[PDB]
Structure 1
């Protein structure tokens, strides 16, 4: 089975064996989450979301409609994803994070992005363009 913390609001039944979902998470009904994932505290996971096996999602991550996380991905704490490039209140793009990629803490991913297999995104990076497989990308400070 899977472990849902009593202080989480998990509405999806589509959750693989060995997955842990921690305190103060929200997971909406259509979310798909694979086996042996760790969804740490304070995450939000929307409906049109697929998360593979052995994925680590650290605290404070929201994964929106139209985002796919492949197997073995690491998402650092407070990583931010997006699906609307020109948002206006009361007015979409797909992101895919490919197998084994790692996204550094508090990075910001623009809409429509592909991050290639085994890529490494630096902490605090802003990713405005696709990142090739196995590439280390970080923003200049």
Structure 2
């Protein structure tokens, strides 16, 4: 009982009941997605990826290898994640940096999350923020304009 749009390319069988995956999403085979998620249009979800239950991923987000999203997380549109702190074309690290977005946290629209980051339970990341350090549980963080 999950809904995969005919215009998505979903290669993972590991998708929970109630989850919706919308148009022009790519989901690679090893991705794990929980129950009652909403994966909005134009998202990319790689292999070494775990996403919990009741997660909302708005449009235009990519979830790279090494990223874990816990239950009840909200990820705003065009939010960007990283798994490589010093990227150079065709220079593959032995191991990708890991990011974890902990239960109930929310990431505002168009925020940028550096590699290796923990965002604590129920944190709120302001729209457009750059997150270069871990954010503590329940903290509201935004970049000064």
TM-score normalised to the size of structure 2? Answer: 0.97
Q: Across the two proteins, how many residue pairs are aligned to each other?
A: 141
- How far apart are residue 43 of structure 1 and its match? 0.1
- How far apart are residue 57 of structure 1 and its match? 0.3
Deviations, residues 20-70 of structure 1 (Å, cap 9, x unaligned): 000000000000000000000000000000000000000000000000000
TM-score normalised to the size of structure 1? Answer: 1.00
- How far apart are residue 131 of structure 1 and its match? 0.1
1:26: which partner in 2? 26
CA distance in 1, matches of 2:76, 2:113: 12
Instruction: Determine helix, strand or coil for the equivalent of 2:85.
Output: coil
- How far apart are residue 132 of structure 1 and its match? 0.1
Aligned mate of 1:133, from 134, 137, 141: 137
Residue segments in structure 2 that go unaligned for 5+ positions in a row: none
Deviations, residues 57-95 of structure 1 (Å, cap 9, x unaligned): 000000000000000000000000000000000102000
CA distance in 2, matches of 1:72, 1:89: 35
CA distance in 2, matches of 1:58, 1:75: 6
CA distance in 1, matches of 2:101, 2:8: 25
CA distance in 1, matches of 2:7, 2:124: 32
Residue segments in structure 1 that go unaligned for 5+ positions in a row: none
1:70: which partner in 2? 70
